[PDB]
């Protein structure tokens with residue numbers, strides 16, 4: 001049936017028909033909701049479940065059909081020939097190759113279908129870099145440097161994705177071992193504490209084990225660890241002139257710069273899997289720009305990340321002896337003012353959570369009008385601070401899984417057998 | 420379904436194992452292909468009247484509850500258990516319904532709270548004062564019971580959780596109902612120029628009261644009268660004695676001008692429009708009360724755009740740059756309002772809990788329920804507070820949501836279904 005979602009602030013009701021198109025499971029049942037589970041088995045893509053000639057043609061036919069519907073040429077001569085072309089290819093090689101137009105369409109729609117992404121108003125503005133001719137980690141490094149340079153654009157960030165060769169037998173995977181192209185190292189200290197980003201302690205140790213000489217500072221850009229065609233991964237240093245960073249300062253608190261905080265301008269996720277028409281692209285780094293709260297709330301103030309609230313609140317001379325003084329909430333706002341101010345002062349693209357969630361509501365309205373719906377995961381869409389003063393808090397959302405999609409996959413060091 | 424389901428806390432790495440979901444009794448709204456986790460009222464969280472429960476539907480619902488009760492008192496399979504089952508079955512046969520024992524009523528009410536997946540306050544669930552008002556026959560009698568509840572629960576600011584339970588639904592034409600959404604709430608008045616005075620959330624109910632004969636003072640914080648329906652009769656208006664309504668004027672520890680905003684709020688949140696379901700019986704009037712978490716007032720009541728909507732005025736008094744959203748002037752004022760709310764309640768010695776303490780307690784409660792009960796149903800969308808979400812521990816806590824009985828359920832507004840005499 002048609003499903004209605006209401007905004008409880010504006011009373012707008014939208015009617016969802018698009019969910020009728022989905023075939024992937026969510027993890028919920030009629031009797032249990034798993035809406036807050038970060039990784040049900042239905043959002044991940046193991047190298048176990050790579051398809052076969054059997055399973056592959058229906059998935060391919062589904063995608064070709066939706067592509068030719070999207071260009072208003074359903075059933076055309078070009079459509080019929082492409083289905084026959086793809087069928088013969090799967091039959092004689094156990095796989096098939098996307099056309100360039102199909103690859104671009106599939107990457108844009110994987111973003112459009114990402115129910116956890118608040119930035120999807122931009123979905124049709126995506127630069128797609130076809131790297132399917134790559135064969136070595138040196139080639140991967142070259143493609144990644146070009147991506148970083150293009151997407152950074154001297155601070156005027158541009159969304160981009162680079163797509164490396166698809167999975168074949170699961171023993172010749174292309175993988176970026178980094179979770180993002182640009183990230184900071186973390187180091188376990190003798191006294192038991194952590195230097196740098198605690199989230200990256202394990203990956204940092206693998207780089208050190210592979211020969212990386214760590215500077216052992218608080219914000220050391222990690223090297224790239226690149227695996228091509230299932231071989232052992234190889235280390236590379238991104239040229240530093242390509243790595244745009246912002247020193248964080250505060251418009252009012254002159255002492256804030258003395259905290260020594262910085263962050264990088266370019267968020268570039270490199271560990272997800274792109275699925276298009278049954279094909280699995282296990283290396284597909286994609287980049288956009290930051291929403292301020294990603295840095296100011298989560299990276300800086302998560303207890304398991306840089307965890308700076310206590311230091312900031314002390315410089316603010318807040319009463320920290322009782323929770324009900326809301327000293328953490330006060331420091332949190334000031335930290336997020338500093339992040340936005342610093343990026344804006346340096347002319348590095350960033351969006352605040354008020355502007356981003358407002359754009360997302362507009363996007364939802366666009367999608368319901370032209371597409372009949374928009375899958376959206378409230379748990380991820382609502383920002384991690386000031387939730388109910390953003391309009392998405394009051395927006396009912398339906399979450400469902402459409403393909404093409406981005407999926408999580410296992411960390412390669414848990415599956416890879418080395419030299 | 421699998422026997423064991425695991426939830427992870429992504430901050431602490433603690434993994435918990437849920438087996439209680441196997442006892443889930445009714446639907447969530449989700450399917451295998453869609454998640455409705457952010458829908459506020461899926462039809463499965465509601466209860467419509469006229470249909471009532473039939474004889475055949477009622478026995479298994481009653482047996483399931485009676486079994487659960489005798490299991491909890493470590494008397495499962497006992498002589499008393501089997502005799503109670505026989506007594507209930509015979510009542511349902513001769514009268515099409517049955518009456519709960521006092522002990523069963525208390526157990527059922529406490530467990531409806533324990534099972535309320537959207538409540539962050541459930542560490543308190545076993546400390547609930549249950550007032551049995553099933554002997555009530557008139558709206559005047561309902562008023563008396565409600566006044567006693569308010570006085571007991573308020574306790575001069577040392578608030579005590581309580582519930583008052585009126586007679587259960589029979590044929591659906593004799594329902595007891597409190598037409599108010601909460602026992603204490605402020606009126607809202609639509610003005611000819613489109614503005615609203617008082618609380619915009621309550622305009623519809625305010626107009627009903629005025630139509631029923633309430634003379635409104637037409638101020639910003641007017642306590643609404645009680646509109647009470649006994650035995651399916653037309654509802655009747657009563658004024659709550661003002662000495663029973665504890666209120667807190669809102670001031671700020673630093674900003675001396677904050678008191679000049681003229682804000683106040685009431686101390687006792689007392690939901691009065693939900694339905695309590697125990698063993699297939701439906702208690703359509705069951706007002707229950709606890710105490711506030713501060714964000715309920717400081718974030719939602721005061722700062723929702725469709726409520727009192729005070730962010731702009733507060734931000735002006737703070738001399739904030741209000742031209743760009745990226746100055747975060749809304750976020751800065753929001754914190755200061757919530758500091759004021761907690762400071763004022765604590766200064767007046769009226770029970771309140773901040774969102775840091777409440778969520779920390781809920782995590783401890785959840786862990787204990789997993790260890791001793793096999794699980795704890797929780798709705799993340801409602802449990803995470805409406806400000807500073809990720810600096811509270813519940814943001815990082817995976818949760819499983821499922822529906823256990825006894826339960827609290829929403830029900831349609833009575834003015835939409837009531838047959839006027």
Ligand code: HEM
Nearest residue numbers: 111114116117118119122159160286287288289290291406
């Ligand atoms: C253009 C600016 C963009 C902004 C401002 C933005 C914003 C965000 C934010 C804030 C999140 C939550 C991240 C977190 O909590 O860790 C997110 C998630 C996500 N973004 Fe976007 N995004 C943008 C572009 C893109 C692009 C270009 C892609 C891919 C082509 C993309 C794909 C995704 C996916 C797949 C997720 C969720 C991953 C999951 O399912 O768990 N985003 N986005």
Ligand code: HEM
Nearest residue numbers: 532535537538539540543580581707708709710711712827
């Ligand atoms: C003792 C202190 C208590 C605290 C601090 C507390 C806290 C809360 C909060 C903050 C909410 C969300 C309210 C909203 O956003 O509008 C809530 C919901 C709820 N509370 Fe509690 N509560 C307490 C006691 C109780 C009691 C005594 C009962 C019933 C006996 C109860 C039953 C419920 C239910 C059923 C809901 C969710 C309604 C729904 O399903 O939508 N609470 N609670």
Ligand SMILES: CCN(C)CCN1CCCc2cc(NC(=N)c3cccs3)ccc21
Nearest residue numbers: 119267268269272286287288289290291294
């Ligand atoms: C701690 C991070 N967790 C593990 C999620 C990692 N991830 C998954 C994919 C979506 C995602 C988005 C961001 N941010 C962004 N604005 C963007 C990155 C790329 C395009 S936009 C940052 C991280 C992630």
Ligand SMILES: CCN(C)CCN1CCCc2cc(NC(=N)c3cccs3)ccc21
Nearest residue numbers: 540688689690693707708709710711712715
């Ligand atoms: C705008 C109000 N919305 C519509 C929800 C009303 N409601 C539903 C039931 C749970 C609930 C809890 C609170 N607060 C509390 N601490 C309590 C009230 C009673 C015991 S604890 C306030 C309101 C509600």
Ligand SMILES: C[C@H](O)[C@H](O)[C@H]1CNc2nc(N)[nH]c(=O)c2N1
Nearest residue numbers: 036037038379380814815816817
């Ligand atoms: C347990 C819960 O699912 C988890 O902490 C989620 C909550 N919402 C989130 N939302 C976003 N955008 N990013 C996250 O990492 C998370 N974490």
Ligand SMILES: C[C@H](O)[C@H](O)[C@H]1CNc2nc(N)[nH]c(=O)c2N1
Nearest residue numbers: 393394395396457458459800801
């Ligand atoms: C659309 C969304 O479900 C709605 O705004 C919810 C979000 N979470 C909430 N959480 C609580 N505690 N109370 C609420 O009223 C809401 N509203």
Ligand SMILES: [Zn+2]
Nearest residue numbers: 028033449454
């Ligand atoms: Zn669900």
